[PDB]
């Protein structure tokens, strides 16, 4: 997150670090007691790595009460996903067991009506990603309020040019982002789950290529079907 804050400890139950090899990978977020929805270019890549998720945590180095790390049973894939487009970028990861819920650690309602969310709507991201242009990684959960973009000006020739699908949504970019390591994180509007974190493209923070979020909503029937 670049151009954010330190978040609150634990004042996001939901929100979860998908590792792989001990080290902080993706974002994620709990959405069941044994689910967590990422993003599918995180596991391109984890080919024989232990792949796991870290529930409960605010650092990802300091020891905490709440922290559990959970091995992966299930890793589902949005199958029309691919590594060289931004369309359909979604992961389920089914944890070893139930979650063990708590204060920490809970889930987060998701949207099933598709509604685009209004422009200029702040929506709230979180993670560990980078959090400046020198590469800087965190050690605690961070945090930033970005506006909505429509869909139209998202879409113009000097911004992403006709990328953006009515399954994708676009938040302003100008120097508040999400950045490398907030993939597969949440994007939250109305207290609701609204968005994944994916990129096309390396550069942050720059206005001219506003973030890109996979709309939920957009694939409640794939969701569900999954979950069952
Ligand atoms: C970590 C893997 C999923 C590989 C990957 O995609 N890396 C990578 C590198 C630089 C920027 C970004 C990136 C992420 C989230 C948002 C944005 C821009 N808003 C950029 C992403």
Same mark, same amino acid.
């Given at each position: 997150?670049?151009?954010?804050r330190?978040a ?5 139950p939901?929100?979860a ?8 990978? #993706? ?6 007691e044994?689910?967590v929805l990422?993003?599918?270019? #995180?596991?391109?890549?984890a080919?024989?790595? !232990? ?15 709440? !922290?559990?790390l ?7 894939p ?5 590594p060289? *487009?931004?369309?359909?970028?979604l ?6 067991? !139930? ?11 998701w949207?099933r ?7 200029? *709507?702040?929506?709230?991201?979180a ?22 973009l ?8 000097t911004?992403?040019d006709?990328?953006? *699908?009515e399954?994708l949504?676009?938040?302003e970019?100008?120097?508040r982002?999400?950045? !490398?390591?907030?993939?597969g994180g949440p ?9 994944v974190?994916t ?9 001219k290529?506003?973030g890109?979020y *996979?709309?939920?909503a ?7 079907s999954?979950?069952?």
């Amino acid at each position: 997150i670049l151009g954010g804050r330190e978040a609150e400890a634990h004042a996001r139950p939901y929100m979860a670090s998908v590792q792989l090899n001990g080290a902080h990978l #993706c974002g994620g977020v709990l959405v069941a007691e044994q689910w967590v929805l990422s993003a599918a270019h #995180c596991l391109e890549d984890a080919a024989d790595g !232990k792949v796991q998720v870290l529930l409960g945590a605010h650092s990802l180095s300091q020891p905490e009460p709440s !922290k559990r790390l959970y091995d992966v049973l299930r890793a589902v894939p949005h199958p029309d996903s691919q590594p060289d *487009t931004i369309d359909h970028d979604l992961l389920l990861l089914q944890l070893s067991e !139930k979650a063990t819920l708590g204060p920490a650690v809970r889930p987060l309602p998701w949207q099933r009506v598709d509604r685009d969310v209004a422009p200029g *709507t702040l929506c709230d991201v979180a993670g560990w990603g980078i959090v400046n242009h020198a590469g800087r990684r965190p050690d605690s959960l961070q945090h930033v309020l970005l506006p909505v973009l429509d869909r139209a000006t998202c879409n113009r020739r000097t911004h992403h040019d006709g990328a953006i *699908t009515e399954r994708l949504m676009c938040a302003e970019s100008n120097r508040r982002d999400s950045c !490398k390591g907030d993939s597969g994180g949440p994007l939250v509007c109305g207290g609701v789950l609204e968005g994944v974190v994916t990129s096309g493209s390396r550069v942050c923070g720059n206005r001219k290529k506003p973030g890109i979020y *996979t709309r939920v909503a957009s694939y409640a029937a794939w969701i569900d079907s999954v979950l069952a």
